[PDB]
Amino acid sequence: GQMRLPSADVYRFAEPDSEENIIFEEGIPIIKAGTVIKLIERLTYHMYADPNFVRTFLTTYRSFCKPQELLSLIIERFEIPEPEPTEADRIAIENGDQPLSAELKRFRKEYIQPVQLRVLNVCRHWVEHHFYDFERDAYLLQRMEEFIGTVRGKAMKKWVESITKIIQRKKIANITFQSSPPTVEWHISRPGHIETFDLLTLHPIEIARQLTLLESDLYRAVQPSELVGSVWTKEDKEINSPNLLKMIRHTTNLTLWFEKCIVETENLEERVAVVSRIIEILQVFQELNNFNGVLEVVSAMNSSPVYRLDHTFEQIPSRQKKILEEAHELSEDHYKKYLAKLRSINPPCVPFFGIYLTNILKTEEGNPEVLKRHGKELINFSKRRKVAEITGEIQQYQNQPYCLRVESDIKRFFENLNPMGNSMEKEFTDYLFNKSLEIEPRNPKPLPRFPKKYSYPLKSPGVRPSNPR
Amino acid sequence: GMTEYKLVVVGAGGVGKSALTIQLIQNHFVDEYDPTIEDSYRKQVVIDGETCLLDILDTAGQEEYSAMRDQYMRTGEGFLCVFAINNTKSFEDIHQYREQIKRVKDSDDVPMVLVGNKCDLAARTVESRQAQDLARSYGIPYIETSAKTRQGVEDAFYTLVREIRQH
Amino acid sequence: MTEYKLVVVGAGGVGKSALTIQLIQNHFVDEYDPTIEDSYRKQVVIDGETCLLDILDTAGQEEASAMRDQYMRTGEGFLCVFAINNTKSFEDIHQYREQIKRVKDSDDVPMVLVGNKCDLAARTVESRQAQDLARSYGIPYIETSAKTRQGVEDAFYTLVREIRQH
Numbered sequence: 001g002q003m004r005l006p007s008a009d010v011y012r013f014a015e016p017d018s019e020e021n022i023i024f025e026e027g028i029p030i031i032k033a034g035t036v037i038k039l040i041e042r043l044t045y046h047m048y049a050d051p052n053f054v055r056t057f058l059t060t061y062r063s064f065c066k067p068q069e070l071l072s073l074i075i076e077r078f079e080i081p082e083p084e085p086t087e088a089d090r091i092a093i094e095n096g097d098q099p100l101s102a103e104l105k106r107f108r109k110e111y112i113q114p115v116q117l118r119v120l121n122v123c124r125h126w127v128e129h130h131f132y133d134f135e136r137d138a139y140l141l142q143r144m145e146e147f148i149g150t151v152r153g154k155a156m157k158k159w160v161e162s163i164t165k166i167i168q169r170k171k172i173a174n175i176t177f178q179s180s181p182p183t184v185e186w187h188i189s190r191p192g193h194i195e196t197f198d199l200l201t202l203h204p205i206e207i208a209r210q211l212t213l214l215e216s217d218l219y220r221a222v223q224p225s226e227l228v229g230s231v232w233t234k235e236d237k238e239i240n241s242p243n244l245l246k247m248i249r250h251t252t253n254l255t256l257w258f259e260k261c262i263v264e265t266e267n268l269e270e271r272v273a274v275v276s277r278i279i280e281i282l283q284v285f286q287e288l289n290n291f292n293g294v295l296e297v298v299s300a301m302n303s304s305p306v307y308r309l310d311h312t313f314e315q316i317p318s319r320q321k322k323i324l325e326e327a328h329e330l331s332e333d334h335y336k337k338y339l340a341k342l343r344s345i346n347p348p349c350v351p352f353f354g355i356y357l358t359n360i361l362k363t364e365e366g367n368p369e370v371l372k373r374h375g376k377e378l379i380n381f382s383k384r385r386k387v388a389e390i391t392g393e394i395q396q397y398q399n400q401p402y403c404l405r406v407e408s409d410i411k412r413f414f415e416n417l418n419p420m421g422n423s424m425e426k427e428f429t430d431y432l433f434n435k436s437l438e439i440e441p442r443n444p445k446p447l448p449r450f451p452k453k454y455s456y457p458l459k460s461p462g463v464r465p466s467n468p469r
Numbered sequence: 470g471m472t473e474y475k476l477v478v479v480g481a482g483g484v485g486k487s488a489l490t491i492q493l494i495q496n497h498f499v500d501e502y503d504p505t506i507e508d509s510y511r512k513q514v515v516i517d518g519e520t521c522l523l524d525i526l527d528t529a530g531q532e533e534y535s536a537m538r539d540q541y542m543r544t545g546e547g548f549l550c551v552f553a554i555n556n557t558k559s560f561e562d563i564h565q566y567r568e569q570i571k572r573v574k575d576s577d578d579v580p581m582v583l584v585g586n587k588c589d590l591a592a593r594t595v596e597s598r599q600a601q602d603l604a605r606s607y608g609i610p611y612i613e614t615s616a617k618t619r620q621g622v623e624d625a626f627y628t629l630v631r632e633i634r635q636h
Numbered sequence: 637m638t639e640y641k642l643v644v645v646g647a648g649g650v651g652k653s654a655l656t657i658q659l660i661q662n663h664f665v666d667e668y669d670p671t672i673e674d675s676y677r678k679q680v681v682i683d684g685e686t687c688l689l690d691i692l693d694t695a696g697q698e699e700a701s702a703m704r705d706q707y708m709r710t711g712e713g714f715l716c717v718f719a720i721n722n723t724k725s726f727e728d729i730h731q732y733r734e735q736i737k738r739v740k741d742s743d744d745v746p747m748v749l750v751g752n753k754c755d756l757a758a759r760t761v762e763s764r765q766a767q768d769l770a771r772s773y774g775i776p777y778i779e780t781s782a783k784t785r786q787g788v789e790d791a792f793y794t795l796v797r798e799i800r801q802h
């Protein structure tokens with residue numbers, strides 16, 4: 001038979017499952033909704049582990065339970081009463097013999113020890129992967145240290161001593177590869193001559209590599225705390241989502257830099273060379289699976305100032321027209337081909353973050369926080385699972401590092417790019433559009449001629465890499 | 470067979486804009502949503518007795534990707550310009566959204582509707598007369614919607630389709 | 637994209653977590669933080685086919701030895717890990733092999749025998765002894781180092797191939 005449980009009067013987590021406290025989806029069960037007590041019971045269940053559920057819960061619980069209250073509840077979960085001696089144990093003791101204590105031993109082995117270990121695993125994941133709760137609330141950290149540091153008894157001792165050390169390391173807080181990274185490539189600008197760095201003087205292969213390293217680092221720095229609760233859209237977004245915003249602002253700045261490079265090149269032949277060079281950078285982005293970079297270029301080519309430059313795109317080689325068209329088609333039909341391509345490539349990659357943001361926001365906005373059943377309000381956990389499925393996908397692509405060498409000067413050049421200068425957004429984008437009208441006027445106005453601005457060769461070195469001994 | 474209309478929702482972030490398309494597309498009578506589902510943004514409808522397909526682009530949450538707005542907007546034949554009736558700044562943003570749409574579509578007469586969205590019980594700060602005056606100055610319809618009761622939602626989208634049909 | 641459920645098992649301290657984190661993050665963990673249960677995901681192209689690996693990293697400490705049936709039920713293939721400088725961990729392999737067979741009620745479960753820490757000179761389990769055991773199980777034997785990455789992709793991706801052909 002099943003093990004008997006403590007009385008639900010002394011231990012709240014022994015209440016029977018009912019539709020008034022837990023609802024399952026239609027081989028471990030999947031929870032649709034439940035009270036917080038039932039969610040924590042199943043988070044730390046004696047019959048099975050659920051590591052996905054631990055991640056989902058720790059990522060999303062603050063929408064229904066405060067951090068201080070979560071810690072109180074898992075401490076209450078940990079403190080399980082042992083059963084009293086049975087009739088057979090009583091009779092042995094009355095005869096001066098040692099009792100078998102068979103039911104007590106089974107309850108320790110099959111209920112207390114698994115539940116207590118799974119509570120500690122929640123604590124371990126909480127400290128390792130969601131430490132911001134403790135960075136933001138020093139008293140919460142004190143309570144966790146005290147709880148862990150006072151767990152007695154030898155069955156948990158190895159993990160208690162380990163978790164204590166992990167906490168202490170987190171308070172005061174290296175990559176190996178299957179091969180060497182390729183050699184850094186140089187074109188007109190030579191190493192150390194940062195004053196000459198520009199779109200056409202750096203090597204287009206190395207532009208794409210260094211932007212990919214930068215954009216990969218920005219992608220990898222975004223934590224789920226910047227996403228849950230849609231906080232990057234709210235009034236405190238600069239406080240709560242700084243890494244996400246830095247990543248988006250880099251993408252926006254690079255797109256605007258591409259547009260500015262194009263429309264400030266007034267000579268037609270020179271502007272064709274500029275657009276052709278940006279499409280070559282896009283080709284290397286594709287080869288590197290840097291989809292953020294691909295769409296940075298596509299967004300620039302479809303911007304109002306650039307899209308209308310029919311005389312420029314007329315002279316682009318047909319093969320490059322095809323490269324740009326197939327990159328543009330990634331975004332068509334609500335990113336259908338992009339989503340399929342992302343799920344087929346071999347990482348490392350840099351995803352486009354915008355689709356994740358829209359899906360998190362709409363999941364949050366389109367589902368209720370609670371479900372009402374039999375007069376009770378149950379936490380709608382299915383909604384939280386959907387959000388954590390998205391943050392889990394994000395995290396999966398954050399693991400794999402690029403095998404490319406940083407070039408500190410090129411990296412600094414792109415970190416310091418500031419095409420808008422001190423101008424506000426509207427005056428700058430109006431400036432770009434007015435430049436477009438200047439260099440290719442609306443029909444029937446005639447096309448003017450403009451002098452060249454570049455004194456160095458415009459011929460591209462191409463995007464196939466070189467390899468000296 | 471049937472006509473497909475490509476509609477684009479534009480407007481300030483952080484003030485409940487996404488509720489408009491969610492409430493339209495939703496199982497009207499079950500408050501549930503999975504936006505990752507293929508064609509959670511397509512809906513076959515009957516407007517003035519003529520069946521058509523709406524394809525709705527709502528990039529809510531991507532407002533900080535400001536250099537992508539041109540590309541997103543160019544996909545659309547008609548536009549819902551949305552502000553929140555308790556956020557004056559989102560109302561003041563409407564002029565620049567409309568100017569950007571006109572530039573992207575290269576037309577001074579693009580089908581569009583002005584939508585005032587009630588996203589919570591916070592105090593209204595844009596009166597309906599202010600928004601009606603703005604819509605009239607642009608020559609476009611004005612519809613108010615509730616983010617919670619679905620009131621006005623069908624009217625906003627159907628009015629836009631009528632603007633496209635009568636363009 | 638096909639999904640594969642891999643489980644890493646073996647005695648405490650043999651390097652199950654270090655192997656997994658090296659595969660996932662290309663990083664070697666120097667600390668010895670005993671695992672309770674961790675899970676990782678990895679999209680990777682293997683033999684031209686994209687798949688999604690779910691990797692369960694399990695507890696080797698004996699105090700957790702009564703909690704294994706639940707993860708053995710879900711797993712589709714098992715990396716059975718010992719350390720080549722730890723003869724007791726090699727002697728523990730057959731207990732994991734037998735429990736997996738009992739739980740899954742099968743003589744034909746995808747498995748790979750892994751001898752980890754092969755970067756260390758002071759070996760106490762000879763390759764021949766481990767290879768003999770692997771042949772008796774009908775499975776391959778791969779020596780690995782989570783520190784240097786030697787053999788790590790080979791071990792995990794060989795297990796994927798055995799699930800795919802199962």
Ligand SMILES: N[C@@H](Cc1c[nH]c2ccccc12)C(=O)N1C[C@H]2CN(Cc3c[nH]c4ccc(Cl)cc34)C[C@H]2C1
Pocket residue numbers: 298301302306307308310313314316320321322324325326328
């Ligand atoms: N004649 C064919 C093929 C073609 C010619 N030029 C091209 C350049 C790239 C890809 C295809 C072509 C056509 O579809 N057009 C001619 C015009 C020129 N204009 C190019 C453009 C500017 N910005 C863009 C961003 C993305 C994409 Cl895909 C294209 C562009 C857009 C109009 C469409």
Ligand SMILES: Nc1nc2c(ncn2[C@@H]2O[C@H](COP(=O)(O)OP(=O)(O)NP(=O)(O)O)[C@@H](O)[C@H]2O)c(=O)[nH]1
Pocket residue numbers: 646647648649650651652653654655665666667668669670671672694695696697752753754755756780781782783784
């Ligand atoms: N030299 C060397 N040390 C290794 C290697 N793999 C793991 N170690 C070291 O061995 C120790 C234990 O590693 P760990 O991955 O935690 O082992 P585990 O098998 O996961 N232990 P547990 O079962 O308790 O979770 C750590 O100090 C780790 O750095 C290896 O290939 N070479």
Ligand SMILES: [Mg+2]
Pocket residue numbers: 652653654669670671693694696
């Ligand atoms: Mg471990």
Ligand code: NA
Pocket residue numbers: 555556557558594
């Ligand atoms: Na206001």
